[PDB]
Amino acid sequence: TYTAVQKRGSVGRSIDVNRYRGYDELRHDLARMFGIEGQLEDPQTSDWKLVYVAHENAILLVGDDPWEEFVNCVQSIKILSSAEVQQM
């Protein structure tokens, strides 16, 4: 019932997204957990692409949706490098 978070070359993590207030908190925390602090909080500054798995297995950008809908549909979360993105 928790949400897996994956990042290439790191040990995966698992989180209850309902613990979070919204996207800023979620990002800060994930930056902490993956030793990547500072690099997710500003999605305009940050190279990484914070992304999630959705019904019909559709990969979507985190933060487009209002928080409530995201919480209700998110199946897992990935942090993607620019290269991973270019390899999709």
The residues spanned by each domain of the chain are: 1-88
Domain 1-88, what architecture?
A: Roll (3.10)
* 78 vs 66: CA distance, rounded Å: 19
Beta strands in 3-57 (DSSP E): 3-7, 13-15, 49-54
The CA-atom distances, in angstroms, between 41 and each of 9, 38, 57, 72, 82 are: 20, 6, 26, 22, 17
**CA dist., res. 76 & res. 59, Å (int):** 10
The method of structure determination was X-ray
DSSP reduced 3-state for 17: helix
Q: What is the resolution of this structure in A?
A: 2.4
| Amino acid, single-letter form, for residue 35 | G
